[PDB]
Write a protein that binds this ligand. Structure first.
Ligand SMILES: C[S@@+](CC[C@H](N)C(=O)[O-])C[C@H]1O[C@@H](n2cnc3c(N)ncnc32)[C@H](O)[C@@H]1O
Length: 219
């Protein structure tokens, strides 16, 4: 017997993500990057983009800041595309592609000034372990922006209409992702870890987990 197989984040899936990233979703990346810059005022140092995929968020951040960026993704197929995209954009000097998993990040302790992630958290198995790793690699005084969304209401609404036409079931998955179910879920995850300082936000720009590493309250 034989089979032809399709699974998430494989070569075919990476191509689909890349195509959408370059077309329908393209405008969201500069907006999200701008939102991140404006929110925290971090414009240099080290930034880790977790679940970077075809690399569009990293590329947008590079174009608006002076960060040294590492784009971490567990899919070889995503990383092959991201490498090409980064090179095409003349950003090889700005963004390093790192093959690896959020559950065992190949980065030293206390390294990152900023950790960002779009559209990955909703897929992670073992989120407690993932968030312990995220906290481990975050520098004291560092910030995160981990979640999903479209940057602003106008883009959210226009893109959603098109996504629903293409992929009707996306409507319900997106509705589950960008909601209070995840605010509750992730509050509970961070609380089990014992994180002293965070915000989890939900609004027109999306759903985002914003951890601040600070000297802890229990001493
Ligand atoms: C929907 S894509 C989003 C891609 C990109 N961040 C963007 O917004 O265009 C989700 C990505 O997370 C990656 N991913 C999923 N689980 C992961 C894990 N445990 N560790 C690292 N990457 C992961 C996938 O391979 C995929 O590239």
């Amino acid at each position: 017997g034989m089979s032809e197989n399709k699974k998430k984040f494989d070569k075919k899936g990476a191509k689909n993500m890349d195509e959408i990233s370059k077309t329908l979703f393209a405008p969201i990346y500069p907006i999200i990057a701008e939102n991140i810059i404006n929110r925290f005022g971090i414009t240099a140092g080290t930034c880790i983009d977790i679940g970077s995929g075809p690399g569009a968020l990293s590329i947008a951040l590079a174009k608006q800041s002076d960060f040294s960026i590492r784009a971490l993704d567990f899919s070889k197929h995503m990383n092959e595309i991201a490498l090409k995209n980064i090179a095409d954009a003349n950003l090889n000097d700005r963004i390093q592609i790192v093959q690896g998993d959020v559950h065992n990040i190949p980065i030293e302790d206390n390294y990152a000034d900023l950790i960002v992630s779009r559209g990955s958290v909703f897929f992670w198995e073992d989120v407690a372990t993932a968030f312990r790793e995220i906290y481990r690699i975050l520098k004291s005084g560092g910030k995160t922006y981990i979640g999903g969304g479209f940057g602003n209401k106008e883009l959210r609404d226009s893109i959603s209409a098109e996504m629903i036409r293409k992929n009707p079931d996306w409507k319900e998955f997106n509705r589950k992702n960008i909601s209070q179910e995840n605010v509750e879920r992730f509050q509970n995850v961070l609380d089990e870890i014992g994180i002293s300082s965070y915000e989890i936000i939900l609004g027109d720009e999306g759903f985002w987990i914003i951890i601040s590493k600070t000297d802890q309250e229990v001493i």
